Serine protease NS3 (Zika virus), 435 residues
Amino acid sequence: MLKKKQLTVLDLHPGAGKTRRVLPEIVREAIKKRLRTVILAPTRVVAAEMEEALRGLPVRYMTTAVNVTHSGTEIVDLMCHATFTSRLLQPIRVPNYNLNIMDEAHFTDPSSIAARGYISTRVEMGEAAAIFMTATPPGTRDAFPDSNSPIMDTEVEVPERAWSSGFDWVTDHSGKTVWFVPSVRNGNEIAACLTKAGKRVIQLSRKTFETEFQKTKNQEWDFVITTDISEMGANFKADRVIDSRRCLKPVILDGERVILAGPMPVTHASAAQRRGRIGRNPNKPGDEYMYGGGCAETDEGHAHWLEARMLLDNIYLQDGLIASLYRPEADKVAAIEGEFKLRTEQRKTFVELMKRGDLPVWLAYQVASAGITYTDRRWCFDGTTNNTIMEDSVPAEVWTKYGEKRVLKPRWMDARVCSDHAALKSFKEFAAGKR
Ligand SMILES: Cn1cc(C(F)(F)F)nc1[C@@H]1CCCNC1
């Protein structure tokens, strides 16, 4: 599969050994053939596991998840999906890799969709080879794939709020459970309910993943409450998955604002990945998968696909050519290639609002396309009254860089900036001119 002009989809079931068995073999072949290679990890936890499986081989780790001394003789680079897309957007020159390997190639974050589109366009052009590793490739309709050991699948009503009665099967369990919830706020309520009942609970989310995931290997626990971030390679020594089968979906209303719609059904790929956390030990059959709803294709019209088109329109490919999205996922957005292409100064602002500002892609695009400079924060305060960000049922207030107290009322409203305490705290600092 290491011949140019070819994209291979390695669709082995979860736990088949794509990362620890197949990946080192591919890397050995690539090094033997002198192919300049990139290995793309979804998260820093998967990058650290990749280092363990590739230990010894000459790989340059362009991540702070690994403390390795690079010898300067490596032709294989390893970085996160976001780092690849980030360096492509920045004026830093990215080598034209002969071989592009993406682990967990089902990841639906905007930068992972943009990386797949850039890589597949290069392959379509006959300029490179690529391998996409995932049990659930884009376009999968099977939520119950094969596993290392048999799994008990059980359709049951799963609590999405705290409960006093009616769900004995949840707490009358003597093993370890991984519970997928649609949001951090929903996870907090369920975790507080389990803690009140004498349970040891760890909570995981996109922002707190690195610190808290370490606790799953450092201490004993009864439950892990996680958002969909644990679908991307996170391993646990658990015997049960409780899956709400629900997710939050960012949606752009009338091209003017972003809302977090739902909770709504997960896609089949997400349900298969969530179920995939268990049934991984062939010596421990009978791990349980309790699911609380059905699947639907909620990736259609999801903002991440539009956001990925905003990223690719501002990545240089060849003269005025623009990368297309990877074909099985190109129908998820009604978009024209090049419609989000920005001029040089606005594009520089767009990059900075994402890289330094930490704003969602859609919100960074609104600000940059309006001709506003990175450091100009007047837009955080001059929106309509219906854009007032609320904190505990009362308007959120910040001290501006001018020393005044103002109501946070952004010109463009993106629900992701105030979806939880940590997101709102970060957006208040941005509005205050603190970064
Ligand atoms: C010029 N400027 C910019 C901002 C911001 F912080 F909201 F962006 N506030 C101001 C006020 C306007 C009224 C007099 N005090 C300064």
The longest strand covers residues 257-265.
